Amino acid sequence: AVNQSSSVEVSSESYETIFSQRIIRDLQKELVVGALFEELPMSSKILTML
Amino acid sequence: AVNQSSSVEVSSESYETIFSQRIIRDLQKELVVGALFEELPMSSKILTML
16 A cells, blocks of 8 residues: 555555545446336236226 | 948948847647546545445
8 A cells, every 4th residue: 555665764554545435336227118118007916808 | 241241341240230038939739638637636645445
């Protein structure tokens, strides 16, 4: 961390730096089939019609 | 020259001409990368994030 290069004063070891807890986000698919098709509510397990 | 032609007799030596004290140049370049992306300020040698 503070190494590479540590010369000539304080060398110390490694973890000697502030870290950031913030996240970021890359790519995504845009959702085009999960919200485009009509919902049919039903109270059973199978629905039948002629 | 300055010694030719003597008008009519009396003439002066070389380096008798007044000039302009200022500095200038015809062109510079084009420059754009230094004012494009944001700056990220950082006190430490390095920074980590998840």
